[PDB]
């Protein structure tokens, strides 16, 4: 009997009635230090925004300064800049090393808790705006959120996690929305709610092959998703889970390595299978709207919103940053298995086969 | 700017239950509840009067003081006189304790003593038994330890030793002095305390004594003051009150208040709304006021709390302290009191007293409508402004013991349990003061009231006390003050807010205590809490779920009235609410149901199978804090099942 | 229907969360042992 356990859930509820009620909450509070830190963090926001919005007026020039050379102890599998705060979080197969590019350290290191044969596929930035959190998406289905991930007083701590689904696993955040679209090998795109901690739309895929990623829009449902087999549908969720497919056009028969779409109104799905050739499609069109080959053998690429450089990899070491319209600006020499814009500056890593990670910059 | 979009955006996973652990809060050591109580079964007016006959030892002035009691002794005769203050006294004190064993004695003799103590003695071993004592007539006790009484024949003082007095007498006992070098007697009473404490190796604390005078002190001889000057502050504190205040320079200031206005003021002293009764109440007020505000909280309880007569004559003490000190008159006490003749208290006390007997000329002379003093008021004012900046743990308001008086009538009542709420509010150390104080008892009686505006504040009240000491659900059930609370869960007019509260406090009353849930169970709150189920309010959801799931906790009898109102198929619509604060309480309530199987017939299995199910459909579920629950639910499943999940789990290996 | 039963709770017993796969393990032990 002993074995009986009782969870706190019931007692801990009970504290509701223990703090204060009557008074105004501390957020509410016009001259609290948490309300100023957080106005002082978006007007730190704004700047930021501001001159990386001067930085694209000028147009972008040829890239290759090497802010710092580091060395992690693990493979580089997946790379996200924080949009404003320089944490460079790169994670691996059983850790996440969180690196610097202002001092040039090591700030953190993690243990995802997966087992040797699961793999980090994703990653996000919640909530990027302030008070962020880490989004670490297991290949196997695992997500988990940690918090406190680069903070000197604070250790890692690890918010919610729960089995998604059941290429690995994909997935892309929605901070306006508050939705969670998990998606990999399975046929179906779920969309897991992080308010109501449900999953509110499970839309089937249609296709053989593994979603091998997924990106949607801003203010609009346009959840694209690259396959294996080649094809790339598009569903919009505001219509039926049967009749949410749009178009399917497919010119393409290799792993979709990085079907990403712009965040303009003026949306392009600039994806890239492992054939290695851009072809920019529109969610209006059937066909491509411009064509491209660049390297025969891809290994991993990158792309950048704001400004449309497609940071393409090499097998012979080299780094093409071409523009969408095919124009050459760089061939950096160096299994570059990772490169990662900023979402605001043009900053850009690398990471070859060996664990090496660089940060390149434009003056 | 691009800073609106940032302010408007939902902050996902930033709320109580992802910041804060899941965790319940530990609960202190509520030492609030008094440890028994005491009742004064018998009193004991031995009265050396020696009426007609002056004391050797002093050589009192030709006026003298003459009036005993109240009472005139040379108007009446001699034996009349000794007889009628012994009724008086008898009476005045039934205004404190009417319920006890009087027997006077009036000059006694040594026997008489000897029998009278040990037949009140022997009334109530256990129990506390009050020793009056008048030794107004006879000779001053002496330095050995002894006090005078007469012989048979009225002839002779003869000597009583102390400690054979406190043989006699048993150990729960109070003594009362009122003689001149009394202190004498307190110092003696202590010797002998410790010579039998020296004995006992090969009854202290119990003894409680009070005293008229200090040692070497002597008794005023004043003509104005009555001679039973301190029996008088003990047992007529209004009285002396009024005609002391008469006396002071502050009546300049009140000019057309005399001592014959003073004796025939209207009321009496149990109407509080009357004039002579107003005075009485507030005296209670400031006095216990403080008290608590003085003396450690220790000995508060002690004095002011374990029983009422101990607490009144300790009340009126504090009185006599100030008037004697007025006339080179120090009181003394057996469990030393700090002085508060200084206090600052007495001030308002003053201000009463000049409010209330301001307007007599006018309800005397000119019969007007006597209007009742702001007094109250301005002390419920000064308790809420305390309360405006009152957030930080600074030194409690002194006016706590005040707002309990309030509670007591009905003009003040709503004005007082409000901001007894909002103190509550402040923070869970402020209930425990409260339950200190001795809230409780108070609280309680108006769960009888039937007034519906009355309802939503207690509700506010017990949330906050239940959430503390949830031992209380104990008393709640003796008093059926459970139907008090069914009623507001079933009046759809009250505010979902303070309904959030009663289900709550529902939900602590049946935690794990089967006596409640069987009378729970009675009242058919399983089917008044379905009624509610589907309230446009997340809280009440969860918690009329929780509620739900403990009133069936080992008890089959609710699981049936469960089953004939088919709780389980109502609570399958909130195992997909959006709320997962709902989601977990959904899941507790559906694991406690199936729990309390108890092997009961064929019909109970297909249930939780059909339940089984329905929890089985909970799996992909983001909050692992649900899926917690749902583990424990399991648990529930997997005990009542033991042999059949062994079956299962002995297969697959 | 105990067959189902005990499905789900392999899926609690290897829950991401820590705290979870914990208290699912220590029940799903409790069982083995019976």
């Known amino acids: 009997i002993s074995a009986t356990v009782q969870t706190g859930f019931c007692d801990w509820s009970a504290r509701y009635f223990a703090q204060p009620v009557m008074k105004i909450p501390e957020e509410h509070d016009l001259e609290s230090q948490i309300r100023k830190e957080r106005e002082w963090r978006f007007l730190r926001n704004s700047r930021v925004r501001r001159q990386a919005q001067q930085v694209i007026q000028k147009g972008i020039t040829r890239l290759d300064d090497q802010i710092f050379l580091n060395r992690n102890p693990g493979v580089p599998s997946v790379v996200k800049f924080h949009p404003f705060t320089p944490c460079i979080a790169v994670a691996d197969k059983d850790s996440i090393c969180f690196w610097d590019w202002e001092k040039g350290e090591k700030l953190d290191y993690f243990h995802n808790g997966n087992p040797r044969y699961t793999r980090v596929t994703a990653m996000e930035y919640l909530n990027g705006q302030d008070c962020s959190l880490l989004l670490t998406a297991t290949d196997d289905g695992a997500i988990r959120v940690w918090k406190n991930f680069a903070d000197l007083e604070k250790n890692p701590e690890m918010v919610t996690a729960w089995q998604g689904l059941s290429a690995g696993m994909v997935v892309d955040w929605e901070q306006e929305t508050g939705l969670l679209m998990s998606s990999g090998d399975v046929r179906i795109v779920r969309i897991w709610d992080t308010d109501r901690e449900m999953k509110v739309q499970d839309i089937p895929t249609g296709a053989d092959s ?3 990623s997924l990106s949607c829009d801003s203010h609009r449902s346009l959840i694209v998703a690259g396959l294996g087999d080649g094809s790339i549908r598009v569903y919009d969720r505001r219509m039926a889970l049967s009749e949410c497919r749009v178009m399917t056009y497919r010119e393409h028969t290799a792993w979709v390595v990085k079907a990403s779409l712009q965040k303009r109104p003026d949306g392009h799905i600039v994806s890239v299978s492992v054939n290695g050739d851009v072809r920019i499609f529109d969610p209006r069109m059937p066909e491509s709207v411009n ?67 660089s940060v390149y910059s434009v003056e | 700017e691009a800073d609106l979009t940032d302010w408007n955006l939902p902050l996902a996973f930033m709320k109580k239950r992802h910041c804060e652990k899941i965790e319940g809060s530990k609960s202190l050591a509520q030492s609030w509840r008094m440890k028994d109580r005491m009742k004064t079964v018998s009193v004991a007016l031995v009265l050396c009067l020696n009426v007609g006959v002056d004391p050797p030892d002093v050589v009192k002035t030709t006026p ?52 009278l103590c040990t037949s009140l003695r022997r009334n109530a071993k256990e129990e506390r038994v009050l020793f009056h004592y008048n030794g107004h007539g006879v000779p001053r006790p002496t330095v050995n330890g002894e006090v005078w009484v007469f012989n048979k024949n009225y002839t002779q003082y003869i ?88 006396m002071q320079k502050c009546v300049s200031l009140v000019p057309g208040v005399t001592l014959d206005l003073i004796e025939k003021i209207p009321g009496r002293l149990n109407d509080r709304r009357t004039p002579l009764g107003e005075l009485n109440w507030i005296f209670t007020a400031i006095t216990d006021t403080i008290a608590w505000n003085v003396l450690p909280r220790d000995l508060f309880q002690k004095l002011f709390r374990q029983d009422l007569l101990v607490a009144s004559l300790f009340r009126n003490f504090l009185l006599a302290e ?60 000064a308790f809420q402004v305390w309360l405006t900046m009152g957030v930080e743990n600074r030194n409690p308001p002194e006016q706590l013991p005040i707002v309990l008086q309030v509670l007591l009538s009905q003009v003040h009542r709503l004005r007082a349990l409000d901001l007894l709420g909002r103190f509550l509010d ?28 009355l309802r939503p504040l207690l509700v506010f009240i017990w949330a906050k006390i239940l959430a503390v000491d949830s031992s209380c659900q104990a008393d709640l059930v003796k008093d059926n003050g459970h139907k008090y609370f069914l009623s507001v869960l079933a009046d759809p007019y009250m505010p979902a807010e303070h309904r959030t509260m009663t289900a709550f406090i529902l939900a602590v009353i049946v935690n794990s205590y089967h006596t409640g849930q069987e009378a729970c169970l009675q009242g058919n709150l399983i089917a ?94 983001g909050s692992p804090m649900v899926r917690k629950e749902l583990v424990v639910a399991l648990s529930h499943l997997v005990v009542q099942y033991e042999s059949n999940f062994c079956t299962v789990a002995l297969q697959f290996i | 229907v105990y067959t189902q039963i005990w499905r789900v709770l392999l899926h609690l017993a290897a829950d991401p969360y820590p705290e979870v796969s914990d208290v699912a393990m220590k029940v799903l032990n409790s069982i083995a042992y019976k």
């Open chain 2, 64 to 115: 003298c003081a003459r009036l005993e009691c109240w009472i005139d002794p040379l108007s009446m005769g001699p034996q009349k006189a000794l007889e009628t203050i012994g009724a008086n006294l008898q009476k005045q004190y039934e205004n404190w304790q009417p319920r006890a064993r009087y027997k006077q004695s009036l000059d006694p003799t040594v026997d008489e003593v000897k029998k």
């Open chain 1, 210 to 212: 593994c979603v091998t």
């Open chain 2, 159 to 246: 000597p009583l030793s102390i400690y054979d007095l406190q043989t006699w007498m048993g150990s729960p006992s109070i003594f009362v002095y009122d003689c001149s070098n009394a202190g004498l007697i307190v110092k003696s009473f202590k010797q002998f305390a410790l010579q039998r404490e020296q004995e006992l190796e090969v009854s202290m604390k119990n003894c409680i004594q009070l005293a008229a005078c200090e040692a070497t002190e002597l008794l005023p001889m004043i003509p104005d003051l009555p001679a039973d000057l301190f029996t008088s502050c003990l047992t007529t504190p209004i009285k002396i009150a009024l005609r002391w205040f008469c």
């Open chain 2, 426 to 453: 402040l923070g869970p150390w402020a209930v425990s003061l409260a339950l200190s104080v001795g809230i409780f008892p108070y609280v309680l009686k108006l769960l009888q009231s039937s007034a519906r505006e």
């Open chain 2, 528 to 621: 008044i809490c379905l009624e509610q189920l589907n309230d446009p309010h997340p809280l009440l959801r969860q918690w009329v779920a929780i509620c739900l799931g403990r009133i069936w906790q080992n008890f089959d009898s609710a699981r049936w009235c469960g089953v004939r109102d088919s709780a389980h198929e109502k609570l399958y619509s909130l195992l997909s609410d959006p709320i997962p604060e709902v989601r977990c309480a959904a899941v507790f309530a559906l694991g406690t149901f199936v729990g309390n199987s108890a092997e009961r017939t064929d019909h109970s299995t297909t249930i939780d199978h059909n339940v089984a199910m329905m929890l089985a459909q909970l799996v992909s579920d």
């Open chain 1, 291 to 357: 064509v491209l080959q660049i390297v025969k053998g891809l290994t991993a690429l990158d792309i950048h919103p704001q400004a449309d450089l497609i940071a393409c990899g090499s097998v012979n070491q080299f780094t093409a940053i071409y523009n969408s319209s095919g124009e050459l600006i760089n061939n950096i020499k160096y299994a570059i298995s990772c490169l990662a814009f900023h979402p605001h500056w043009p900053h850009l890593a690398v990471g070859s086969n060996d664990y090496y990670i």
């Open chain 2, 322 to 381: 100030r008037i004697m000190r007025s006339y080179n008159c120090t009181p003394v006490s057996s469990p030393r009191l700090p002085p508060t003749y200084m206090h600052a208290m007495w001030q308002a006390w003053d201000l009463a007293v000049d409010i209330c007997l301001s307007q007599l000329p006018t309800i005397i002379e000119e019969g007007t409508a006597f209007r009742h003093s702001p007094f109250f008021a301005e002390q419920l004012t």
